[PDB]
Amino acid sequence: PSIKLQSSDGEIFEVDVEIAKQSVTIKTMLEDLGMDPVPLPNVNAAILKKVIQWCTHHKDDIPVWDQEFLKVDQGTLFELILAANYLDIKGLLDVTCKTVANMIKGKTPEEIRKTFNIKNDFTEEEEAQVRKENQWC
Amino acid sequence: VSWDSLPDELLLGIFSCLCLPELLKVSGVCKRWYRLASDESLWQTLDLTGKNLHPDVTGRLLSQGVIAFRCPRSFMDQPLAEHFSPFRVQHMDLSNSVIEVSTLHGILSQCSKLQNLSLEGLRLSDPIVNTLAKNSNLVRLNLSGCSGFSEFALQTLLSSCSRLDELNLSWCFDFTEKHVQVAVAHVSETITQLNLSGYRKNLQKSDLSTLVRRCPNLVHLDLSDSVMLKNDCFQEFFQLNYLQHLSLSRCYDIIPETLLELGEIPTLKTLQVFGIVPDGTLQLLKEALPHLQINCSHFTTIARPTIGNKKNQEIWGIKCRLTLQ
């Protein structure tokens, strides 16, 4: 009924086997390895605590709770998307990506570079074609 | 912190959460996003209906590995007969659009992997019809109302599509007896749904025989508006042991009473005989054949990309993820 998870930095969280199983990654291990302190070298204690929280909330499972849940700085959100991916939790990988999707909506390409801090690989002539290639829309 | 440090698989996730206009926005953020914003995973199903469009946009978009392309009632009337590179497009609906014949050709000349195509209400041409022959894997083809092609180009197309299941080749106002003859003489024996309505004096009984002889697997057979057909055709429908849907609407030479004989076809589930059956003898006909569904439906569903209202973008069941609605 219980399983212990080990963050890439020391912490051990005891989650319900059924909730931990929500992670395909953590699931394959608890089987193809039958380990107790499940080694999670790619997720630190902060993010994992979040993953477990999100999975607990949806143990039976954008909602308001999720929105408040993902109401964190870009860094944490970037860490969760990775975590969710690494732990392969389709559920939480879906909301986090849509959250980032909602962030892009409205903002212009410039406002987007600002936020997510993205280098403009473009040439004013390339943005000229990218634009032309998208006029029809 | 920067997100450009995010895995390629994840940006695609985020991008999959964006609607068409949003996706084209992001494509202009950085060169990376631009590459990814056109990733094949993002463009499988595209719905651009009633959109006026330049052939280069349709080509450049079809060149991104697009499988289901819904585009009825659209407008493509300019140069550059797509030659872009071969297209993955499998399911495509260009019905009732206005497309320069050379633009129609250019796009279909980059298609070989089509499974379901609709060119309903489109002026075509042998060059066009012949390029369609490439799509031998065609399962459903709709050329209803099309014109501009010979019975010879039609012949190589039908000869070539040997696994065709549904074929709506009705009301090609463009053609003669020969087209009808070619039609029944070369439709694949694999055919199960055929709509050849609209050819009055050009569809003889003998053409019905040929069809019946070569195609025993017909489940749907629409012969509406077959002015020549008399009840003495019924002996041909009897030789189809899987026919469960027949249409003879507007076949004025079929005496309403003789319709009782269609009770011989055991598998028959529905009969459509509009415009030749008096309301009275029609309700008596329904009395006699309680197993049938008479004049229950007005429109053909044979090889139709979509059937319904508010139910658009279900191009042969596919709910196009990218649209402009």
Short mmCIF file of all heavy atoms in Angstrom, two decimals, chain A residues 49-84:
data_model
loop_
_atom_site.label_atom_id
_atom_site.label_comp_id
_atom_site.label_asym_id
_atom_site.label_seq_id
_atom_site.Cartn_x
_atom_site.Cartn_y
_atom_site.Cartn_z
N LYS A 49 7.80 16.51 -4.74
CA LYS A 49 6.76 16.80 -3.75
C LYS A 49 5.54 17.34 -4.49
O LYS A 49 4.40 17.06 -4.12
CB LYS A 49 7.30 17.82 -2.75
CG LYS A 49 6.40 18.04 -1.56
CD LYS A 49 7.01 19.05 -0.60
CE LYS A 49 6.12 19.28 0.61
NZ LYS A 49 6.74 20.25 1.54
N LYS A 50 5.79 18.10 -5.55
CA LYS A 50 4.72 18.67 -6.37
C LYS A 50 4.03 17.55 -7.16
O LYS A 50 2.81 17.45 -7.15
CB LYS A 50 5.30 19.70 -7.35
CG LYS A 50 5.90 20.90 -6.68
CD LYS A 50 4.83 21.77 -6.06
CE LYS A 50 3.95 22.38 -7.14
NZ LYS A 50 2.86 23.22 -6.58
N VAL A 51 4.83 16.73 -7.84
CA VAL A 51 4.32 15.62 -8.65
C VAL A 51 3.40 14.75 -7.81
O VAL A 51 2.30 14.39 -8.23
CB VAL A 51 5.48 14.75 -9.20
CG1 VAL A 51 4.95 13.60 -10.00
CG2 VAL A 51 6.38 15.60 -10.07
N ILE A 52 3.86 14.41 -6.60
CA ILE A 52 3.08 13.57 -5.70
C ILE A 52 1.79 14.29 -5.29
O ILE A 52 0.72 13.67 -5.16
CB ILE A 52 3.91 13.23 -4.44
CG1 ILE A 52 5.16 12.46 -4.84
CG2 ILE A 52 3.06 12.41 -3.47
CD1 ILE A 52 6.11 12.21 -3.70
N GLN A 53 1.89 15.60 -5.09
CA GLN A 53 0.74 16.40 -4.70
C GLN A 53 -0.29 16.41 -5.82
O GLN A 53 -1.48 16.19 -5.60
CB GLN A 53 1.17 17.84 -4.39
CG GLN A 53 0.01 18.71 -3.96
CD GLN A 53 0.42 20.13 -3.63
OE1 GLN A 53 -0.40 20.96 -3.24
NE2 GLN A 53 1.71 20.42 -3.79
N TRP A 54 0.19 16.68 -7.04
CA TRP A 54 -0.68 16.71 -8.20
C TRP A 54 -1.33 15.36 -8.43
O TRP A 54 -2.52 15.28 -8.73
CB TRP A 54 0.11 17.08 -9.44
CG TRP A 54 -0.77 17.29 -10.62
CD1 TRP A 54 -1.37 18.45 -10.99
CD2 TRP A 54 -1.22 16.29 -11.54
NE1 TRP A 54 -2.18 18.24 -12.08
CE2 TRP A 54 -2.11 16.92 -12.44
CE3 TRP A 54 -0.97 14.92 -11.69
CZ2 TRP A 54 -2.74 16.23 -13.48
CZ3 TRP A 54 -1.60 14.24 -12.72
CH2 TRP A 54 -2.47 14.89 -13.60
N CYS A 55 -0.55 14.29 -8.31
CA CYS A 55 -1.08 12.95 -8.50
C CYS A 55 -2.06 12.55 -7.42
O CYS A 55 -3.03 11.84 -7.69
CB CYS A 55 0.06 11.94 -8.58
SG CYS A 55 0.94 12.14 -10.11
N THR A 56 -1.81 13.01 -6.21
CA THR A 56 -2.71 12.71 -5.10
C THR A 56 -4.06 13.36 -5.38
O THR A 56 -5.11 12.73 -5.28
CB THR A 56 -2.14 13.25 -3.78
OG1 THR A 56 -0.92 12.56 -3.48
CG2 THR A 56 -3.13 13.08 -2.65
N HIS A 57 -4.02 14.63 -5.74
CA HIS A 57 -5.23 15.38 -6.06
C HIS A 57 -6.04 14.66 -7.13
O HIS A 57 -7.27 14.69 -7.12
CB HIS A 57 -4.86 16.78 -6.58
CG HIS A 57 -6.04 17.67 -6.82
ND1 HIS A 57 -6.76 18.24 -5.79
CD2 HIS A 57 -6.65 18.05 -7.97
CE1 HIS A 57 -7.76 18.94 -6.30
NE2 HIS A 57 -7.71 18.84 -7.61
N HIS A 58 -5.35 14.02 -8.06
CA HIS A 58 -6.02 13.31 -9.13
C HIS A 58 -5.86 11.80 -9.02
O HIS A 58 -5.77 11.12 -10.04
CB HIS A 58 -5.48 13.76 -10.49
CG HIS A 58 -5.63 15.23 -10.74
ND1 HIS A 58 -4.68 16.16 -10.35
CD2 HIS A 58 -6.62 15.93 -11.35
CE1 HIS A 58 -5.08 17.36 -10.71
NE2 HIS A 58 -6.25 17.26 -11.31
N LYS A 59 -5.83 11.28 -7.80
CA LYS A 59 -5.65 9.84 -7.61
C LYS A 59 -6.74 9.05 -8.31
O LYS A 59 -6.52 7.91 -8.73
CB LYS A 59 -5.62 9.49 -6.13
CG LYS A 59 -6.88 9.80 -5.36
CD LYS A 59 -6.68 9.48 -3.89
CE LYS A 59 -7.94 9.74 -3.09
NZ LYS A 59 -7.77 9.44 -1.64
N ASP A 60 -7.91 9.67 -8.44
CA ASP A 60 -9.05 9.04 -9.10
C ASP A 60 -9.09 9.50 -10.56
O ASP A 60 -9.66 8.84 -11.42
CB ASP A 60 -10.35 9.43 -8.39
CG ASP A 60 -10.43 8.87 -6.97
OD1 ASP A 60 -9.56 8.06 -6.61
OD2 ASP A 60 -11.36 9.22 -6.23
N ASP A 61 -8.45 10.63 -10.82
CA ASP A 61 -8.40 11.21 -12.16
C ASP A 61 -7.48 10.43 -13.11
O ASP A 61 -8.01 9.93 -14.13
CB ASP A 61 -7.92 12.67 -12.10
CG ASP A 61 -8.79 13.54 -11.22
OD1 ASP A 61 -8.94 13.22 -10.01
OD2 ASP A 61 -9.31 14.55 -11.72
N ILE A 62 -8.70 23.84 -17.97
CA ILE A 62 -7.83 23.48 -16.82
C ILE A 62 -8.51 23.82 -15.52
O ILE A 62 -8.85 24.98 -15.27
CB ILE A 62 -6.51 24.26 -16.83
CG1 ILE A 62 -5.67 23.83 -18.03
CG2 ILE A 62 -5.77 24.04 -15.50
CD1 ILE A 62 -4.32 24.52 -18.11
N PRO A 63 -8.67 22.82 -14.64
CA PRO A 63 -9.32 23.03 -13.35
C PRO A 63 -8.73 24.22 -12.61
O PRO A 63 -7.63 24.68 -12.93
CB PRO A 63 -9.08 21.69 -12.64
CG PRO A 63 -9.14 20.73 -13.81
CD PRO A 63 -8.19 21.44 -14.74
N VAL A 64 -9.49 24.74 -11.65
CA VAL A 64 -9.04 25.87 -10.86
C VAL A 64 -7.93 25.44 -9.92
O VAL A 64 -6.96 26.18 -9.72
CB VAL A 64 -10.23 26.48 -10.07
CG1 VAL A 64 -9.74 27.49 -9.04
CG2 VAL A 64 -11.18 27.14 -11.05
N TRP A 65 -8.08 24.24 -9.34
CA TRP A 65 -7.06 23.73 -8.42
C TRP A 65 -5.73 23.59 -9.17
O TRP A 65 -4.69 24.00 -8.68
CB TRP A 65 -7.47 22.36 -7.85
CG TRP A 65 -6.51 21.86 -6.81
CD1 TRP A 65 -6.53 22.11 -5.47
CD2 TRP A 65 -5.35 21.05 -7.05
NE1 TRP A 65 -5.45 21.51 -4.85
CE2 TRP A 65 -4.71 20.85 -5.80
CE3 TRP A 65 -4.79 20.48 -8.20
CZ2 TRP A 65 -3.55 20.11 -5.67
CZ3 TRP A 65 -3.63 19.74 -8.07
CH2 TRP A 65 -3.02 19.56 -6.81
N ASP A 66 -5.78 23.00 -10.36
CA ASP A 66 -4.57 22.84 -11.16
C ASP A 66 -3.98 24.21 -11.49
O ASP A 66 -2.78 24.43 -11.36
CB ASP A 66 -4.87 22.07 -12.45
CG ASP A 66 -5.27 20.64 -12.20
OD1 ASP A 66 -5.56 20.30 -11.03
OD2 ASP A 66 -5.31 19.85 -13.16
N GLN A 67 -4.81 25.15 -11.90
CA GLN A 67 -4.30 26.46 -12.21
C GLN A 67 -3.60 27.04 -10.99
O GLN A 67 -2.50 27.55 -11.10
CB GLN A 67 -5.42 27.39 -12.65
CG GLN A 67 -6.17 26.90 -13.87
CD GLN A 67 -7.16 27.92 -14.40
OE1 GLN A 67 -7.96 27.63 -15.28
NE2 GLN A 67 -7.10 29.15 -13.86
N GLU A 68 -4.23 26.97 -9.82
CA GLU A 68 -3.58 27.50 -8.64
C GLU A 68 -2.31 26.69 -8.41
O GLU A 68 -1.27 27.24 -8.05
CB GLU A 68 -4.52 27.46 -7.41
CG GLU A 68 -4.90 26.07 -6.85
CD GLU A 68 -3.81 25.42 -5.99
OE1 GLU A 68 -3.32 26.07 -5.04
OE2 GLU A 68 -3.45 24.25 -6.26
N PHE A 69 -2.40 25.39 -8.66
CA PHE A 69 -1.28 24.47 -8.48
C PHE A 69 -0.09 24.91 -9.34
O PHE A 69 1.03 25.03 -8.84
CB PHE A 69 -1.70 23.05 -8.88
CG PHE A 69 -0.60 22.03 -8.80
CD1 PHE A 69 -0.06 21.66 -7.57
CD2 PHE A 69 -0.09 21.44 -9.95
CE1 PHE A 69 0.96 20.71 -7.49
CE2 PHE A 69 0.92 20.50 -9.88
CZ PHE A 69 1.45 20.13 -8.65
N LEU A 70 -0.34 25.15 -10.62
CA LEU A 70 0.72 25.56 -11.52
C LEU A 70 0.95 27.06 -11.52
O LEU A 70 1.48 27.63 -12.47
CB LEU A 70 0.38 25.09 -12.93
CG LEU A 70 0.14 23.59 -13.01
CD1 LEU A 70 -0.14 23.16 -14.43
CD2 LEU A 70 1.36 22.88 -12.49
N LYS A 71 0.54 27.72 -10.43
CA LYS A 71 0.72 29.15 -10.32
C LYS A 71 2.08 29.33 -9.67
O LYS A 71 2.19 29.77 -8.52
CB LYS A 71 -0.37 29.74 -9.42
CG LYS A 71 -0.91 31.11 -9.86
CD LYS A 71 0.17 32.16 -9.99
CE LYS A 71 -0.45 33.51 -10.30
NZ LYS A 71 -1.38 33.93 -9.21
N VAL A 72 3.13 28.95 -10.41
CA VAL A 72 4.52 29.03 -9.95
C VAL A 72 5.38 29.77 -10.99
O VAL A 72 4.92 30.08 -12.09
CB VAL A 72 5.11 27.62 -9.73
CG1 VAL A 72 4.31 26.87 -8.68
CG2 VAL A 72 5.11 26.84 -11.04
N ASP A 73 6.63 30.05 -10.63
CA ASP A 73 7.54 30.75 -11.54
C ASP A 73 7.90 29.85 -12.73
O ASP A 73 7.81 28.63 -12.64
CB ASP A 73 8.82 31.17 -10.80
CG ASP A 73 9.60 29.98 -10.25
OD1 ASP A 73 9.12 28.83 -10.37
OD2 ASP A 73 10.69 30.20 -9.68
N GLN A 74 8.31 30.47 -13.83
CA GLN A 74 8.67 29.72 -15.04
C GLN A 74 9.62 28.57 -14.75
O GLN A 74 9.50 27.49 -15.34
CB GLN A 74 9.29 30.66 -16.08
CG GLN A 74 8.38 31.79 -16.51
CD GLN A 74 8.98 32.63 -17.62
OE1 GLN A 74 9.26 32.13 -18.71
NE2 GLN A 74 9.18 33.92 -17.35
N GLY A 75 10.56 28.79 -13.83
CA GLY A 75 11.52 27.76 -13.48
C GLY A 75 10.87 26.49 -13.00
O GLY A 75 11.15 25.40 -13.51
N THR A 76 9.99 26.62 -12.01
CA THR A 76 9.28 25.47 -11.45
C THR A 76 8.44 24.76 -12.50
O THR A 76 8.39 23.53 -12.54
CB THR A 76 8.34 25.89 -10.29
OG1 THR A 76 9.11 26.49 -9.24
CG2 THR A 76 7.59 24.69 -9.74
N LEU A 77 7.76 25.54 -13.33
CA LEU A 77 6.92 24.97 -14.38
C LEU A 77 7.80 24.19 -15.35
O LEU A 77 7.42 23.11 -15.80
CB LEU A 77 6.17 26.08 -15.11
CG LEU A 77 5.16 25.65 -16.18
CD1 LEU A 77 4.10 24.76 -15.55
CD2 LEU A 77 4.53 26.87 -16.82
N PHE A 78 8.96 24.75 -15.67
CA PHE A 78 9.91 24.11 -16.58
C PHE A 78 10.41 22.81 -15.96
O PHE A 78 10.64 21.83 -16.67
CB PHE A 78 11.08 25.06 -16.87
CG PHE A 78 12.15 24.48 -17.77
CD1 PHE A 78 12.31 24.96 -19.07
CD2 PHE A 78 12.99 23.46 -17.33
CE1 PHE A 78 13.29 24.43 -19.92
CE2 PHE A 78 13.97 22.93 -18.16
CZ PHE A 78 14.12 23.41 -19.46
N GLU A 79 10.58 22.82 -14.64
CA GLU A 79 11.04 21.65 -13.90
C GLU A 79 9.96 20.56 -13.84
O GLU A 79 10.26 19.36 -13.91
CB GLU A 79 11.45 22.07 -12.48
CG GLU A 79 12.62 23.05 -12.43
CD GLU A 79 13.92 22.47 -12.98
OE1 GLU A 79 13.95 21.28 -13.35
OE2 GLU A 79 14.93 23.21 -13.03
N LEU A 80 8.70 20.97 -13.70
CA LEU A 80 7.57 20.05 -13.65
C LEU A 80 7.36 19.37 -14.99
O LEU A 80 7.15 18.16 -15.04
CB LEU A 80 6.29 20.77 -13.25
CG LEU A 80 6.15 21.03 -11.75
CD1 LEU A 80 4.92 21.87 -11.49
CD2 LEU A 80 6.05 19.70 -11.02
N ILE A 81 7.40 20.13 -16.08
CA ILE A 81 7.21 19.54 -17.40
C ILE A 81 8.26 18.45 -17.62
O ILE A 81 7.95 17.40 -18.19
CB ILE A 81 7.33 20.59 -18.54
CG1 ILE A 81 6.20 21.62 -18.42
CG2 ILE A 81 7.26 19.88 -19.90
CD1 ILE A 81 6.13 22.61 -19.56
N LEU A 82 9.48 18.69 -17.16
CA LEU A 82 10.56 17.71 -17.30
C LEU A 82 10.27 16.54 -16.39
O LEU A 82 10.32 15.39 -16.82
CB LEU A 82 11.91 18.32 -16.92
CG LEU A 82 12.46 19.38 -17.86
CD1 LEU A 82 13.78 19.91 -17.34
CD2 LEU A 82 12.62 18.77 -19.24
N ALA A 83 9.98 16.86 -15.14
CA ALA A 83 9.67 15.86 -14.14
C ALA A 83 8.55 14.96 -14.67
O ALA A 83 8.69 13.74 -14.74
CB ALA A 83 9.24 16.53 -12.86
N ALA A 84 7.43 15.58 -15.03
CA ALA A 84 6.29 14.86 -15.55
C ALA A 84 6.70 13.99 -16.72
O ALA A 84 6.26 12.85 -16.83
CB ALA A 84 5.23 15.84 -16.00
#
